[PDB]
Design a protein around this ligand. Structure first.
Ligand code: K20
Lengths: 99, 99
């Protein structure tokens, strides 16, 4: 579909058997999800933005379905205020900026 | 143009008569630029990112040119890690997400 930017580009996603709302974020290198209990191994990471850094847990090869489009890649989990779909997964669903 | 997301969506902007590089950031409500000298008056404001809240200078009705597209809107100036173009200006140049 085509999504205008009058409002936040929030879409429904499916990850780890849960439906959530997440931001399609072209400014996010990586995908960062609100705190959740995912199984499997992980490694710690820190990611920076406005206000400083947050500590996150990095899971690899995590499947996420975005508006019916399937994608699999690295997913960071930590105390983010919002679910953020980053470019690592946006590329996989064929998302582009257009103007 | 149609911009894929395998790289950061970085573009050249023109503000205050000076060229800079900025990130098209659909996950940002507002446009936030690194510390710089801008003409006109400003008001102190606070914005929160992933890592917390920062102090910024708010400039209203500022002319910015993005990839040759003219916009006039609010521009926040403060200690952001990257020049980011937010939805307040992305809408003015006709930007949409598509997949
Ligand atoms: C360094 C470039 C940006 C600041 C990076 N951010 C993505 C933004 O889209 C962020 C995503 C975002 C959105 C809401 C809350 C927290 C983070 N939005 C943001 O900070 O916008 C602010 C300015 O406008 C205001 O509206 C939204 C917040 C304000 S981020 O969330 O900090 C981020 C996400 C994934 C990352 C990462 C940083 O490092 C590598 O992987």
């Amino acid at each position: 579909p085509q999504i205008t930017l009058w409002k936040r580009p929030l879409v429904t996603i499916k990850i780890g058997g849960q439906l959530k709302e997440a931001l399609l974020d072209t400014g996010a290198d990586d995908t960062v999800l609100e705190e959740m209990n995912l199984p499997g191994r992980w490694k710690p990471k820190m990611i920076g933005g406005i206000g400083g850094f947050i500590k996150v847990r990095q899971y690899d090869q995590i499947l996420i379905e975005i508006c019916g489009h399937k994608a699999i890649g690295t997913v960071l989990v930590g105390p983010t205020p919002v679910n953020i779909i980053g470019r690592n997964l946006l590329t996989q669903i064929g998302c582009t900026l257009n103007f």
